[PDB]
Amino acid sequence: MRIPLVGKEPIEAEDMGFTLIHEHLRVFSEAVRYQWPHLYNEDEELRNAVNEVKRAMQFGVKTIVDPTVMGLGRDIRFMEKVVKTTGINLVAGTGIYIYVDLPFYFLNRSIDEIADLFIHDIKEGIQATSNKAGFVKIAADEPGITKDVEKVIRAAAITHKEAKVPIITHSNAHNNTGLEEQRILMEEGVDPGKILIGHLGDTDNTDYIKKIADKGSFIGLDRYGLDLFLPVDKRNETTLKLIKDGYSDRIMISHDYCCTIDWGTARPELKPKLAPRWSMALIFEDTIPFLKKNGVSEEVIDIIFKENPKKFFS
Amino acid sequence: MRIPLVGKEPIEAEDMGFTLIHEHLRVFSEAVRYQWPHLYNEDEELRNAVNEVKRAMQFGVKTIVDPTVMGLGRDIRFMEKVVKTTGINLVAGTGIYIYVDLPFYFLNRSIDEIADLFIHDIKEGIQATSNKAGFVKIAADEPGITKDVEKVIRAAAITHKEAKVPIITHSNAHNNTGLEEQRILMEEGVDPGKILIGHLGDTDNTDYIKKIADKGSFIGLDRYGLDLFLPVDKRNETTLKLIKDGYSDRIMISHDYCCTIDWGTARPELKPKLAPRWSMALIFEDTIPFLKKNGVSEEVIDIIFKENPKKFFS
Ligand SMILES: [Co+2]
Ligand SMILES: [Co+2]
Ligand SMILES: [Fe+2]
Ligand SMILES: [Fe+2]
């Protein structure tokens, strides 16, 4: 009814279950892959995905939210592929993933026709497949909020009030880009409780994370395993600190794991040293057990992975 | 032998004939089209291309050089498609078309692995099709020369000395980006007589065009029809001025025509007003007849469309 899915009927919101709010089956750069597919292996990418998913459903993961959109190589027909061999609840989304500028096609185009693209994937269907998006993704990083960056953000604020779907953001933790994202969305009639400032777990600063959580929006401690931004343990203490400070009603956890990633700054041979234990179920081996071992109840974990996402999708 | 082609054997250089140095069968943004192909029509795009080409071979056009690369939607299998139904000499190329930054895949990647991509298309084959590139394309515009912009330029300077193929540039006429492109290439052991600073016909300033031509490189009066940069007549007088000033040995002419272009800032309904007569054979109806009518011999036109390109490919 409310929450769309992939290769399956649309759920409501309370039947969402244990959810991994931020994960990636596989990412790639549309341009290169389309120009040189001799570098890729549909098979290797399908297996890793399949293998990684089935193991998340074990630890009790019910629904996986995949924020793969334009620029990350969103393949809806590749999404159904794995959903069929694993039977996973996969919420597809829309939007555009960028840091600086838009593709050339966007030259001299209004912000509306941009939000038009998103509104199309929500109500019509992603890539003419019927599978609709459940949200909209937007990204800001080191280069901070620029012209093209802001255009997409405001186009998200519109795709939100018109479709009623939520929006998940991608930001640099030490930048303030997260706050900027929250502000620019809030000023445009965007429901804070309907915005996920992500990756803000890549930093110790608990005051920056708090104020953003105080602003009403969901905070993103979503990149566990990626030690290169912040080691696992350094991350666990942060989550901890906030849980005791009563921010669990806004804390959402995930990995941001890419079964197969395109960038060279994250080669499969770069795993060790950069992200040794980074996986789709790392928070089951380390994080969760860590909290319950430090005095956090079962209600909190079910709140984070169940009740928080439910409030995010309705 | 020297000059590679598409769906045919590689020519030498003197058998190049009358050539349109800069033309586009069709351009599109890899990302969007790959994410939403419901906006495109393989058919409409094939016909326009086919129709436009056959009419250029009439006016005596022997070889067409298509500078469509990453970012413009280079489709080698779509190139052979038309080459077969028209039997045209089509020189494919490589490189990257940008204004600001590279795709994410290029994050933390050396300039070598970039030139590696180009060197692959030259000696191995474009997109694993055997069809090799005859040159490398690079672009700079209003945003001028930036980090990512310069990285590709220097990666071109390398792909040039190692493969021996020439490089065609895309620049803003009123910016100096053209000169910047020439300089950064020259400083890296790049043969000026092996660089095509393009689009510098979009401006009156004949002193800027001259110095660039004096620097040894080929000048680009290559966008006839696109009145929006400079009307046809305003362009003709410029070419004229330089021909009388003995710069014809460096003048190369084309249209830069896109049978089917992706950007909205150039919609098929925007043709009139922006570029009314813009086509693949506009210089036959207007330009050429104009010169021979103002006292320029037959040797000059054959030099521009035959001898100049021959020196550019060898
Ligand atoms: Co992200
Ligand atoms: Co150009
Ligand atoms: Fe992500
Ligand atoms: Fe062009």
Residue numbers in the entry:
A (entry chain A), B (entry chain A): 1 to 314
Extract from the study:
SisLac belongs to an enzyme family called Phosphotriesterase-Like Lactonase (PLL) that encompasses members from mesophilic organisms (PPH, AhlA, MCP, DrOPH) as well as thermophilic (SsoPox, SacPox, GsP, GkL) representatives. SisLac is a native lactonase that exhibits a high promiscuous phosphotriesterase activity. The catalytic mechanisms for both the lactonase and phosphotriesterase involve a nucleophilic attack by a water molecule activated by the bi-metallic center.
SisLac is homodimeric in the crystal structure with overall dimensions of the monomers of being approximately 39×48×56 Å. As for its close homolog SsoPox and related PLLs like DrOPH, GsP and GkL, SisLac is roughly globular and exhibits a (β/α)8 barrel topology. The active site consists of a binuclear center located at the C-Terminal of the barrel. Four histidines (His22, His24, His170, His199), one aspartic acid (Asp256) and a carboxylated lysine (residue 137) are coordinating the two metals. The two metal cations (possibly iron and cobalt, as seen for SsoPox and OpdA) are bridged by a water molecule that is presumed to be the catalytic nucleophile. The active site includes a long hydrophobic channel that was revealed by structural studies on SsoPox as the binding region of aliphatic chains for the AHL substrates. The dimer interface of SisLac comprises 46 residues (44 in SsoPox). The nature of this interface is mainly hydrophobic in both enzymes, but SisLac’s interface tends to be more hydrophobic (56% for SisLac, 52.6% for SsoPox), more charged (SisLac 23.91%, SsoPox 20.45%) and less polar (SisLac 32.61%, SsoPox 36.36%). Q34Y is indeed a key substitution in the interface since it consists in a “pivot” residue, i.e. a residue that contacts its equivalent in the second protein molecule while forming the dimer, and seems to be responsible for the observed dimerization shift between SisLac and SsoPox structures.
